[PDB]
Design a protein around this nucleic acid. Structure first.
Ligand SMILES: [Mg+2]
Ligand SMILES: [Mg+2]
Ligand SMILES: [Mg+2]
Ligand SMILES: [Mg+2]
Ligand SMILES: [Mg+2]
Ligand SMILES: [Mg+2]
Ligand SMILES: [Mg+2]
Ligand SMILES: [Mg+2]
Ligand SMILES: [Mg+2]
Ligand SMILES: [Mg+2]
Ligand SMILES: [Mg+2]
Ligand SMILES: [Mg+2]
Ligand SMILES: [Mg+2]
Ligand SMILES: [Mg+2]
Ligand SMILES: [Mg+2]
Ligand SMILES: [Mg+2]
Ligand SMILES: [Mg+2]
Ligand SMILES: [Mg+2]
Ligand SMILES: [Mg+2]
Ligand SMILES: [Mg+2]
Ligand SMILES: [Mg+2]
Ligand SMILES: [Mg+2]
Ligand SMILES: [Mg+2]
Ligand SMILES: [Mg+2]
Ligand SMILES: [Mg+2]
Ligand SMILES: [Mg+2]
Ligand SMILES: [Mg+2]
Ligand SMILES: [Mg+2]
Ligand SMILES: [Mg+2]
Ligand SMILES: [Mg+2]
Ligand SMILES: [Mg+2]
Ligand SMILES: [Mg+2]
Ligand SMILES: [Mg+2]
Ligand SMILES: [Mg+2]
Ligand SMILES: [Mg+2]
Ligand SMILES: [Mg+2]
Ligand SMILES: [Mg+2]
Ligand SMILES: [Mg+2]
Ligand SMILES: [Mg+2]
Ligand SMILES: [Mg+2]
Ligand SMILES: [Mg+2]
Ligand SMILES: [Mg+2]
Lengths: 166, 26, 95, 148, 103, 97, 190, 140, 14
RNA sequence: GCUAAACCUAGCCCCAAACCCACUCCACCUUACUACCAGACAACCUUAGCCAAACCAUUUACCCAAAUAAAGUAUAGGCGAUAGAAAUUGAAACCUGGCGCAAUAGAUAUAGUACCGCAAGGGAAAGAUGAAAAAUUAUAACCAAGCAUAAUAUAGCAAGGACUAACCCCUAUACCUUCUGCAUAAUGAAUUAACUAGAAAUAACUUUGCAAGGAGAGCCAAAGCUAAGACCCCCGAAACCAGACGA
RNA sequence: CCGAGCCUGGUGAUAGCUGGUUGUCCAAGAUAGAAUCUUAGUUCAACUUUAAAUUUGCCCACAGAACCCUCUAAAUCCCCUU
RNA sequence: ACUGAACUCCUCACACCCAAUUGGACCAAUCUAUCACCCUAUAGAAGAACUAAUGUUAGUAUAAGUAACAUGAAAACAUUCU
RNA sequence: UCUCUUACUUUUAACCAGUGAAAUUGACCUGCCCGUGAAGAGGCGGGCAUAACACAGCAAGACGAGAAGACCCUAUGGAGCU
């Protein structure tokens, strides 16, 4: 058993200078031993990814799954600990930067088939990781138009030189 | 346990090399 | 031939080799041609004389007879009236 | 180990088996070569040349009667108590250039050897001893330490 | 293979053949043990030929730390800043001489 | 992974102890000792090998001949089985014959 | 190697408590082919080829070879200035401090093998001086070998001790055959 | 266990360091990485002749393209160059055709003149001139 | 004949 | 970074020495773990079998008296694969360890526990922070197989040659084996970590020592004798007997 | 799971039958046959592996190697020079 | 006419491409004696090396979130209905 | 039963919620024709073919999965009957 995600909230930074930017905050929080599947948790994390915290809560409140309420409570308690301890004033100025899933400790049981044989029932467990960063959420990457492809093709055709001689 | 010291020393040196490579000191 | 016994753990010999052959100290085994005493009425006297001669063995046969025996049968005996005493030592040997 | 089979599995016949074929040491009939070798009387050779050599070196003093214990102490011949040995014989190989003049007790002495010994003025005594007497005369110190 | 290791181009460090040729090697930090059977070659080298090697080219500085260790090593630094560290564990005097000459 | 992370403690050994500094004492006592006792009598250990080498099966035969009359039941059975196995492996199986 | 008794012993596939019947049929199920457990291929079986009983590496060298080795060791200790002949191993007060100070002043090294003679004829001063140190040892003239000499750096002998060693090493040359062991009273040999 | 293996991971890393840029399970499975590295090294060793042949064919194709652009062919050019006592391999010819067109055009003109002189000598079975640019130099 | 093999049950500790 | 990787002690095997023990009260021979009522009958016995002799019917060390040489000698033996003495010189009392190991090793064992059958019986993994857990602290992280971080982008046993850039250009028919010929559509394989497979005599080769003698009693010897080094696998069947159990 | 049961010991039974047999380099290295209740094995020929002793190994040439009625080829065996 | 190999040549020194098999040289984790203690040498021993034996054990992927699958309805939760 | 099948209900079928297999897997960036090879090629030669990724059904091939074939043959390996 290893626990290194809950300890990232204790990294103290030196005091900045007046000629330095604001630097956004980083809030780490995760739960352990959750009776759920890792694939569904990863699907929920992919549904979330980089969006606003309020939009994520709204999408999870109407999500018909088992871990939706769990992730909702995780985000709620993380926002609470951020506004109470991590020095956060605005409640709607947060966005999820990283959101992934892991795997928990498993056991073994029986399945009982239709003969003397049987199966290995492995109790699947998983976790859930999430990171909260202050400030407005970054806009998504816009798709490159034909001008970008044309410029890249021109650059590729201009970068080629003589080969296999001198 | 596995009795030895030279292989353990080489493994510790490799760990120190990986540490100094991942985190380059000033 | 039992390379290791169960009581002494030594090497045993084959008594048939001792009863049918005779090793000299030079490294030669004296044998006897078979059939020298049976059906002698249909054989020419030349064959009868040839069968009654002390014939030596070969190389692989001598090696086999030596491997079937131990170090006791490869010594040198000094009998009082040994008819094969002059055949123990072999002189005039040039590789 | 080569290819598979008995050459690799180790299940090989004993030394001398030719795979059903009659071996060489069986097709030959028996003969009276070593009938009673464990009962024949063996005698270690002893030439007059080696006796004169021992006398000249000093290991055999020609002032005392020489028998078996004197030859064992001088270490000129090796008398084995076992292997059916009834003493040491005499060899006339060193007939010429033999000047010793000393009595010697030999179990088996030939005519030429006795003649050559009597030429200088020696005495040859032919005696017989049982293997127990041989073992006694070879090493008398353990016989004295025995207690019999 | 070439698809697994990085490559470069063949060029001079600061055009030595055009103007004047300078010595690329700078320092040579040797680590010879005091007692042991693994630095005999390095000991004999420092005893007999290190003076000739230092007098051959004045632009190369030789450092002898003489630290009691087990594997004798040598540090060679150049003008560009590359540091190539090799070990002379159980080598003859001729081998070490050829190695330092190649360096 | 079968590699120990932390280094083992330095196993220091005093090379000048009792049996180390006094090794080989009273060895070869027959030559320079007017021949009183044989050097093979200074070997301390099992009684069935005090001055005798032998082979793997010969040692078992000597043990069953000397000490075999004062062992256990399971130990004697295991010794007999090992002797039978060595006999069947040396006088039936093998090579160079 | 002449005083080595390896007490290492590992059980085979027959001495291990277990393995009697046949686990699963060979033709029935589609598992691996096995006839009994406690095998060197299974988990918890015996060693296939390992130490079987105590192995004794007993072997003796000829007496002449050992005498020549002793003479060679003596020549090596004498040539390299590592042999100091004494007349009477005595000390004024008998203490390890004076002994090690004298050893360091006379330039001997970190170790020295002090050899006396007859064992019983040894003074108490040097005994009490050596009974408190590890490098200094007191062995009689009979208990002198080659390993103890090669382990130390120098050697210390005495005139009667070196005479005894010389005569015992020259007794091997110009002698008779063994024939019977020398433990007998003999006549000339004491 | 007595004096067993205590440095097996180092051998695994030494084998896997050559398989740090492969696709699939070959960069992680040692049992397959061994075979992959073996085949990779074998092909890298055996492809030297292939590389040499490819470079030679590329040089020949470049020379042929240059000769066709100038107004000649490849076999005639090679023959006229080997019949004028000038030893220039394919690499320098390709380098000139790519970088120095003036000397390549001069070589093509010399080759055409040598070919014309050879044709004239063959049709006349020569007698007297036998080519001005001919006349082989005798080295004794 | 009628060949058939009986199944084997593992111990109740895994 | 999740899954999960190493942290030594219960001790385990054989030596030398020593000979080792068995009711606190009740219950234990019937339905043992049952306080109390009328036929007393209960042991005294060649073991067998496998293998080998290429089968096998004679035969095959195992027999419980200390070493060795004799000697693997006389002998027994479908006289053959094998077995094997005796007579004889003889055999120095007393000292506390491992050139063995650390939980897939070493006894199976923390234990003869769970579990299987009415029954004899078979029978397996366990325990890791620390001086202060009455320090529930903040850290020490970093390596395998499985995962997200960071999915795919045309072409081809997954590889090589290469250029300024992954592909695009060319070449190239996985691994060990019974086999003349195997990737062949024959055999084995999902990986990682632990374990597993050449043990030895007579006769041979080399190197010290001594020498007509060598060798720490025994053995060999018309240049020999002693010592050392060097060498000969694993797993997988149907069958037979002996002692106990079941309608 | 009875054309003959479960457990233990003989037993690590035997088995010409199947499979496997662990790091590097270099050198040498490819098979006329006979016997066996044997061709799925074994033993002996021939070849291969080491260090020594001796001197001749290969095409060699004029010449030599009965036959018989009907032909009887391409070749072979001993062979100093080179 | 030209293209066209591991055949030949250019600078180097050349033991660095046969089945079975044989011979010669190095390599590393344990203990012991001798020197050093940021890790190696001289000598003795090995339970001295795993890409394979439907090899034994424990962790974990593809197959596969594939097949199988529960609870009669309303409700004050006091009840009612087939 | 067919000519010639059809009208409905349940199990079941397709999606949502979770426990969740078994056989099997050398790795796959996995198309077709002609020809060749250990004799039946998606990985060999020449051609044709080609943006990538899931869901819902059928079997034509991958000599596909389960049993070291029970049919034929070898075994100086067994057993039953007379
Ligand atoms: Mg095989
Ligand atoms: Mg075969
Ligand atoms: Mg057999
Ligand atoms: Mg027959
Ligand atoms: Mg058993
Ligand atoms: Mg079995
Ligand atoms: Mg075990
Ligand atoms: Mg048989
Ligand atoms: Mg007796
Ligand atoms: Mg255990
Ligand atoms: Mg166990
Ligand atoms: Mg990993
Ligand atoms: Mg291609
Ligand atoms: Mg292999
Ligand atoms: Mg096969
Ligand atoms: Mg075939
Ligand atoms: Mg296949
Ligand atoms: Mg097959
Ligand atoms: Mg398969
Ligand atoms: Mg009934
Ligand atoms: Mg077997
Ligand atoms: Mg066969
Ligand atoms: Mg070319
Ligand atoms: Mg060539
Ligand atoms: Mg070759
Ligand atoms: Mg082992
Ligand atoms: Mg091993
Ligand atoms: Mg492995
Ligand atoms: Mg299978
Ligand atoms: Mg495996
Ligand atoms: Mg499906
Ligand atoms: Mg369904
Ligand atoms: Mg229901
Ligand atoms: Mg579902
Ligand atoms: Mg092919
Ligand atoms: Mg086809
Ligand atoms: Mg295929
Ligand atoms: Mg089959
Ligand atoms: Mg047969
Ligand atoms: Mg049969
Ligand atoms: Mg039978
Ligand atoms: Mg029967």
């Amino acid at each position: 058993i290893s626990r290194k995600w809950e300890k990232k909230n204790k990294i103290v930074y030196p005091p900045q200078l007046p000629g330095e930017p604001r630097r956004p905050a980083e809030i780490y929080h995760c739960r352990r031993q959750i009776k759920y599947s890792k694939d569904k948790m990863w699907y929920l994390a992919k549904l979330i990814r980089g969006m606003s915290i309020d939009q994520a809560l709204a999408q999870l409140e109407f999500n018909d799954k088992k871990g939706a309420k769990i992730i909702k409570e995780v985000l709620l308690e993380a926002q609470d600990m951020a506004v109470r301890d991590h020095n956060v004033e605005f409640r709607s100025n947060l966005y999820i930067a990283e959101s992934t899933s892991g795997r928990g400790q498993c056991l073994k049981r029986i399945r009982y088939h239709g003969r003397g044989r049987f199966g290995i029932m492995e109790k699947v467990y998983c976790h859930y990781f999430v990171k909260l960063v202050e400030g407005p959420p970054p806009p998504p990457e816009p798709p490159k138009t034909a001008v970008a492809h044309a410029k890249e093709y021109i650059q590729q055709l201009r970068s080629r030189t003589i080969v296999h001689t001198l | 346990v596995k009795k030895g010291f030279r292989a353990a020393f080489r493994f510790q040196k490799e760990l120190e090399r990986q540490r100094l490579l991942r985190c380059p000191p000033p | 031939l039992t390379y290791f016994s169960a009581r002494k753990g030594k090497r045993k010999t084959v008594k048939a080799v001792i009863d049918r052959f005779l090793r000299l100290h030079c490294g030669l085994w004296v044998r006897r041609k078979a059939g020298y005493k049976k059906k002698l009425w249909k054989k020419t006297p030349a064959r009868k004389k040839r069968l009654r001669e002390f014939v030596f063995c070969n190389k692989t046969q001598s090696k086999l007879l030596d491997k079937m025996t131990t170090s006791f049968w490869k010594r040198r005996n000094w009998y009082v009236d040994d008819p094969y005493q002059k055949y123990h030592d072999r002189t005039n040997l040039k590789v | 180990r080569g290819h598979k089979g008995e050459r690799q599995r180790g299940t090989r016949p004993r030394l001398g088996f030719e795979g059903g074929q009659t071996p060489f040491y069986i097709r030959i009939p028996k003969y009276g070569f070593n009938e009673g070798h464990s009962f024949r009387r063996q005698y270690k050779p002893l030439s007059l040349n080696r006796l004169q050599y021992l006398i000249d070196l000093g290991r055999v003093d020609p002032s005392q009667p020489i028998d078996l214990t004197q030859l064992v102490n001088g270490r000129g011949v090796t008398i084995q108590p076992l292997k059916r040995d009834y003493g040491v014989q005499l060899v006339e190989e060193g007939a010429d250039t033999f000047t010793a003049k000393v009595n010697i007790e030999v179990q088996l002495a030939s005519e030429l050897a006795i003649a050559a010994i009597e030429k200088n003025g020696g005495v040859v005594t032919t005696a017989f001893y049982d293997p127990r007497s041989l073992d006694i005369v070879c090493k008398p110190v353990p016989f004295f330490l025995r207690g019999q | 293979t070439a698809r697994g290791t990085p490559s470069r181009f063949l060029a001079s460090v600061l055009h030595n053949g055009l103007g004047r040729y300078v010595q690329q090697l700078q320092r040579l930090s040797f680590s010879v043990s005091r007692d042991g059977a693994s630095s005999r070659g390095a000991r004999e080298f420092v005893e007999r030929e290190v003076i000739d090697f230092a007098r051959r080219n004045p632009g190369v500085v030789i450092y002898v730390n003489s630290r009691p260790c087990c594997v004798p090593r040598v540090v060679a630094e150049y003008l560009n800043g590359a540091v190539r560290e090799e070990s002379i564990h159980c080598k003859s005097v001729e081998e070490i001489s050829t190695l330092v000459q190649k360096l | 992974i079968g590699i120990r992370l932390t280094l083992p403690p330095p196993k220091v050994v005093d090379r000048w102890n009792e049996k180390r500094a006094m090794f080989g004492v009273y060895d070869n006592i027959g030559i320079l000792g007017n021949f009183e006792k044989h050097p093979k009598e200074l070997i301390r250990g099992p009684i069935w090998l005090r001055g005798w080498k032998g082979n793997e099966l010969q040692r078992c035969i000597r043990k069953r001949k000397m000490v075999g009359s004062r062992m256990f039941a399971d130990d004697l059975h295991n010794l007999n089985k090992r002797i039978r196995y060595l006999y069947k492996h040396f006088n039936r199986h093998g090579k160079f014959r | 190697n002449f005083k080595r008794i390896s007490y290492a012993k590992t059980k085979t596939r027959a001495e291990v408590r277990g393995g009697g019947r046949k686990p699963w049929p060979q033709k029935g199920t589609g598992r691996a082919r096995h006839g009994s457990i406690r095998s060197p291929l299974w988990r918890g079986g015996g060693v296939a080829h390992g130490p079987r009983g105590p192995t004794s590496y007993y072997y003796m060298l000829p007496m002449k070879v050992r005498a020549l080795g002793l003479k060679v060791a003596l020549t090596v200790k004498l040539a390299q200035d590592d042999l100091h002949i004494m007349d009477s191993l005595e000390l004024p007060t008998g203490d390890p401090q004076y002994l090690t100070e004298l050893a360091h002043y006379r330039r001997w090294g970190d170790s020295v093998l002090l050899v006396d003679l007859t064992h019983e004829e040894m003074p108490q001063s040097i005994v009490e001086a050596t009974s408190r140190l590890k490098t200094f040892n007191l062995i009689p003239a009979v208990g002198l070998n080659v390993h103890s000499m090669l382990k130390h750096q120098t050697l210390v002998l005495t005139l009667p001790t070196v005479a005894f060693l010389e005569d015992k090493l020259l007794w091997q040359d110009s002698r008779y055959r063994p024939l019977y062991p020398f433990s007998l009273p003999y006549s000339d040999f004491p | 266990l007595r004096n067993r293996v205590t440095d097996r991971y180092f051998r695994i890393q030494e084998v896997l360091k050559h398989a740090r840029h492969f696709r699939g399970r070959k960069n992680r499975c040692y049992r397959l990485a061994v075979r992959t590295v073996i085949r990779a090294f074998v092909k890298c060793t055996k492809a030297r002749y292939l590389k040499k042949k490819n470079m030679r064919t590329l040089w020949i194709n470049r020379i042929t393209a240059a000769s066709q652009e100038h107004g000649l062919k490849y076999p005639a050019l090679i023959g006229n160059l080997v019949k004028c006592q000038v030893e220039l391999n394919r690499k320098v010819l390709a380098d000139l055709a790519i970088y120095e067109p003036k000397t390549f055009k001069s070589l093509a003109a010399l080759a055409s003149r040598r070919r014309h002189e050879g044709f004239a000598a063959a049709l006349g079975d020569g007698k007297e001139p036998e080519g001005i640019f001919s006349r082989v130099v005798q080295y004794h | 004949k009628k060949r058939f093999t009986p199944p084997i049950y593992q111990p109740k500790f895994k």
